[PDB]
């Protein structure tokens, strides 16, 4: 069918010239309307030419297909064009679609919105127009920053392809009739990951992300590691507020937030939630005792985050450096301290980050850490012990590390520097007792049975 | 301190140590081998495995005679999905892990399940057992072995000791009195941080 | 919106209450709000149905579905019935004139329909 | 209980093209740190970058403190 | 000090408020007692409070010392909140403490509080009296104004800003104290000033 094809691309040769030149007239225009099937048909064979000629007579219809300047192009022709894009199981049909057209052009991008919207409102096809609604990463700024326009750039000066308010106001009626029908699961586990760089700046007003984000961010699990951005963003933005956000805060870092893979946004979020300049001492040092307590079992991937924003709070609020270096002031404390050992009056499992008694407690977790097997990890908790002598760390030299980077970072060097080895090597590496040469057993050995 | 080859073996340990919710009994007793592994790695050398304390406690939760309610450490608790934990079969006693148990077996029979997860129990307990007498130091003991503490009385109870031998009791009876005395010690001797006493420059 | 119009409706803002209310969505609104705050929504519609008579569809939307989601929260409440009171205050300045206008309704009815009589006559001539 | 600490860190030393030190002063005044740059000259640099004098060093974005770096290797490239 | 001209008072971020005079290197008083941050804090105005200071802290209390005895604090009230603003009425009788979501009016003649009054949605910052010490004008973090009666203390009227703000005065113009125009300062970095003429 590339002879087709060719017939095609000779026929919209044909249409746009007849209509850039101009009972007679009535079949000249029920020319495009039969042509129209046939794109529409060729958009389902290669239909990524087709598209090209789906898009050129879009133009020629816009140009002269009426007695007016005003180029009026059938929003009712594209949205079918829309239909059978976000039907089509091709994928390379939709992605010439998008990088060559809608992040191309602005008139694409509004009509395509307000198709999508009578479309959604008329699941694999979900999931394709959910495809689609994440690809327009980017916003416009101001309204002389559209300034390209695929047909008729209006000299109305006051118009909805004019405004960015209206553009947003589409965008955010598209993305509003998506989630009234309702999202699925990765669906939604996507949004939230891409939401306060993406989803959120393109609305008029969020407010209604206000609700959705607060019901998903209450929930609970990993959903409100990734809510915690949009609410953030929401906080800054347009300043609706969260009723008690610090004890939120508190009840969500936990057990096994350290372990998951978002942890780096969230801790480039807490970055700035405590660089905040109205937090008591009490506050932010419950944040760093449960983060110790927390860091007992976490990754040394996760050590390496957590210390330099430690030495970070350290230097900023010099109250909680009494977790470091508390002397007891009385003898009389002295000698009850040396007749019954100290227990820790660091209350965990405590509500409110304010009565935690985190003040009056140490860092006994983070000088246990300092022997950790790892060198690089065991040299990064000895910030807290040698000196405060660099003014600030930068966590972004220390972020986005894991296995992968700890197990290359002994990749990357020389093949060997020439090693040493263990001498006396024992004979007995396997055997049970081996009881004629008083070495003690592996306990590998002793707790395992080879035979 | 740092070696070229020694250490990314323990990274090696670590990585299969620290992530990898377990999906079998393979997972498990590939898990408990290499515990024992990073412990032979950390004799005499007194440093601190974080990732095989949180497997080790997360075995022992997971071989679930109940379940595990609420207030168990702070160490991420996981699921056993296809049934992986002890049922009422306190007649086959105690046995060492061969190495055959690196291998799955989706028809395997369940008395020869019961067998595997009481030994898989009991080499548990005696893993604590030897990280405790070498960690009896490091003054984070208390928060790092008030979980192990907890989750052995949490195995000491009366609808959790039906499902267990009067062996594994005695291990875990051990394991508690053993943890008692080591945590007495250790609350008698933590001492509070003093750590920047420095010397003036001249 | 609930959180938005709970917010709006407890600091006594203006701008967030307008945004959410030029806006399914009133139905989640209003049954997501706080049983607390329907009085002050109650009092806070009659307020703008009053100063403003072209938005009247909307707003009576808004304090039938409140009426509607949060009847006997009312009832519980009962020293703030004053809040209705008003409310039916300003519905019946709204029923005002009724008759009156019904008359004149039919008056220019027969002058549309001669009109579009006459259109229906030009069209076809 | 957030209020936005963007800008409070701002009294720490700088690193700029030869001097590994400058901390905050001012704007003309930090200029004159880096050797061969006079107290005449920090004044003329200012004016086509469209700094003001009011600021400090550390006071400006990441930016604003690289036109100052292009301009002190090139005066001849703006006109003097 | 309103009345010593030589009189002033610091409350400083560890633990301290303290009492200076301008020809001493030597602050006169010091008062402990508080266990956060301490970061708001007047004097009290009045004939017979001649000597009484009043702080709030990040630790959840207002504490007012006489100056005489530099013990502990004569009278305290915990709140529940971190207590941001404090003003004292210029009876000398009632006092302000601005903490959290809620503004609070205590006794300090019976040591006894009043009334909390909860009006905003984000913390309140600032507290201001107005136009002849009848009416209390408070900012807080959710970009609102609000004036308040002090007799019944009703939400008399308000008005928004487009920034969470930081500091908010209405001054005054001379002979009689009429209010000349308010200023708030916000956290975007502005200082508005709207202005009255009579």
Known sequence: PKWSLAAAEALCRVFVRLLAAGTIINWLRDRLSDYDGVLLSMLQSLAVHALVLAMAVLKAQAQHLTDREEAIFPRSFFL?????????????????????????????????????????????????????????????????????????????????????????????????????????????????????????????????????????????????????????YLIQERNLDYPEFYTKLYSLLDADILHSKYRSRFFRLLDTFLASTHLPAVL????????????????????????????????????????????????????????????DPFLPNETDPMETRAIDSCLWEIVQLQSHYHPNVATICKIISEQFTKQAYNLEDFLDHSYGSLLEAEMTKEVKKPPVIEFMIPKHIFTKAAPEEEKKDSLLVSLWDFG | HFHQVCTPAMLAIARYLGQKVPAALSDFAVGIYLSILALQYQDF???????????????????APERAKSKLGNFPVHEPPAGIRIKDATNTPIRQLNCGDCLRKDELSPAETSSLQIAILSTATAILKSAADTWHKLPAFIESFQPALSVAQHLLTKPNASHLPSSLTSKLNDLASHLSRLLQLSRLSRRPLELHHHRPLA | LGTVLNQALRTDDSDLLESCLQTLIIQNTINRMDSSLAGTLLSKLAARMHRRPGRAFGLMRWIQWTLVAHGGALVTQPDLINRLTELSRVLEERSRGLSSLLALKGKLDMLDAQLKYRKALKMAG | SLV????????????????????????????????????????????????????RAGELTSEELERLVTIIQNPLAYKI | SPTELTTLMSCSDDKTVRLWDLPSNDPTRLFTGHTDYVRCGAFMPGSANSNLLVSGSYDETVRVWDARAPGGAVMTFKHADPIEDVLPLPSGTTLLAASGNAISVLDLVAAKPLRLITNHQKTVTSLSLASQGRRVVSGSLDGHVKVFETTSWNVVAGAKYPSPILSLSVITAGASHDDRHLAVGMQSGVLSIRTRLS
């Open chain 1, 284 to 343: 932010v040092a419950s944040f760093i005792k449960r983060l110790a307590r927390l860091a007992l079992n976490a990754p040394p991937s996760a050590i390496v985050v957590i210390v330099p924003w430690f030495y970070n709070l350290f230097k900023k609020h010099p109250l909680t450096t009494f977790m470091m270096h508390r002397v007891p002031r009385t003898k009389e404390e002295r000698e009850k301290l040396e007749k019954d050992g100290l227990d």
């Open chain 1, 80 to 232: 079918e064009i829309i239909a059978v894009v976000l039907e089509s199981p091709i994928e390379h049909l939709r992605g010439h679609f998008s990088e060559n057209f809608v992040k191309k052009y602005d008139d694409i991008r509004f009509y395509t919105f307000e198709a999508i919207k009578h479309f959604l409102t008329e699941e694999d096809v979900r999931n394709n127009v959910f495809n689609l609604l994440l690809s327009i990463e980017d916003v416009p700024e101001s309204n002389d920053s559209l300034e390209n326009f695929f047909i008729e750039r209006p000299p109305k000066k006051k118009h909805p392809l004019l405004s960015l308010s209206q553009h947003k106001k589409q965008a955010q009626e598209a993305w509003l009739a998506f989630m009234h029908l309702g999202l699925s699961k990765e669906q939604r586990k996507k949004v939230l990951e891409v939401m306060s760089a993406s989803i959120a700046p393109w609305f008029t007003k969020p407010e209604m992300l206000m609700d959705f984000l607060t019901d998903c961010y209450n929930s609970g699990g990993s959903v409100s590691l990734l809510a915690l951005s949009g609410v953030f």
């Open chain 4, 4 to 55: 936005s600490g963007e800008k409070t860190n701002f009294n720490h030393i700088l690193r700029l093209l030869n001097t590994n030190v400058d901390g905050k002063q001012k704007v003309v005044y930090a200029l004159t740190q880096i050797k061969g740059v006079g107290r005449r000259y920090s004044n003329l640099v200012c004016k086509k970058a469209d700094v003001d004098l009011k600021k």
């Open chain 2, 45 to 63: 050398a007194k440093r601190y495995v974080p990732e095989m304390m949180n497997f080790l406690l997360n075995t022992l939760c997971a071989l």
